[PDB]
């Protein structure tokens, strides 16, 4: 028996606060990314990297913010963008009500253990079965071109694609993702937190806001809320595997 009452309006106001902050912190939204991927935009058509020749041509014709071997140059562009993403996600976290009022050490811990889960959530927005938008939508690198990179680089992005194809089938929008990402950041189970209860209290309010968002926005998926908590569980495992690949790479390359 859902009612539009003061409590529900406050949850819609929190949802709008997070959406507006998400738009401010993250230049390329899912709406704009999907417009590019489906050829439904007036913006510049991305240059497609689908083989070694189009990569060499792309390095010139795509304008990257960053300044030997192909696989390593690609991994380094990936590393640079990931640094920029940590800054954007941090800027977003500072807008979540209650976050900057937590103990700084806890804010740092929440971001340290949360940013990779948010990175692969937000990468799904930029992905389809064919490939991924790069350079803020100026380029598109294919999934199979990435898989063709020599070991250990060929298997670096493939689990993120596998996750994305299933995640994107839920058809979440930016209003949904803004709350989803805030729920992930305010996880009271991160290792080494000092003060868990104030994190859980914020997360409880974000979970209420998410549940209401998904009921209003997704009339034909009654258990989408449960499905998204399932994905947050899956992202844990994905990031475990990702940090294992990073160790191999940092060590051996």
């Amino acid at each position: 028996h859902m009612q539009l009452n003061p409590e529900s309006a406050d949850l819609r106001a929190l949802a709008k606060h997070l959406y507006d902050s998400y738009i401010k912190s993250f230049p390329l939204t899912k709406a704009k990314a999907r417009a590019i991927l489906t050829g439904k935009t007036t913006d510049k058509s991305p240059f497609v990297i689908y083989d070694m020749n189009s990569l060499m041509m792309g390095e010139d014709k795509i304008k990257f913010k960053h300044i030997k071997e192909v696989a390593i140059r690609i991994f380094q562009g990936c590393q640079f963008r990931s640094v920029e993403a940590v800054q954007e996600i941090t800027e977003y976290a500072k807008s979540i009500p209650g976050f900057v009022n937590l103990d700084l050490n806890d804010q740092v811990t929440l971001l340290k253990y949360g940013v990779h889960e948010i990175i692969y959530t937000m990468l799904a927005s930029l992905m389809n079965k064919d490939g991924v938008l790069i350079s803020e939508g100026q380029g598109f690198m294919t999934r199979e071109f990435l898989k063709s990179l020599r070991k250990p680089f060929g298997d670096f992005m493939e689990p993120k694609f596998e996750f994305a194809v299933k995640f994107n089938a839920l058809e979440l929008d930016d209003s949904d993702l803004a709350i989803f990402i805030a729920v992930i950041i305010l996880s009271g189970d991160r290792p080494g937190l000092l003060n868990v209860k104030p994190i859980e209290d914020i997360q409880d309010n974000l979970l209420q806001a998410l549940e209401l968002q998904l009921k209003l926005n997704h009339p034909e998926s009654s258990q989408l809320f449960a499905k998204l908590l399932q994905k947050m569980t899956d992202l844990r495992q994905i990031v475990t595997e990702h940090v294992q690949l990073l160790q191999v790479i940092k060590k051996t390359e």
Binding site: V83, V86, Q87, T90, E91, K94, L104, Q107, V108, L111, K112, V115
Partner: peptide, 13 residues
């Protein structure tokens, strides 16, 4: 990890 913490503290300040 030390790198990641350093960037987060920088972005937070």
């Amino acid at each position: 990890n030390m790198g990641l913490e350093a960037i987060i503290r920088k972005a937070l300040m």
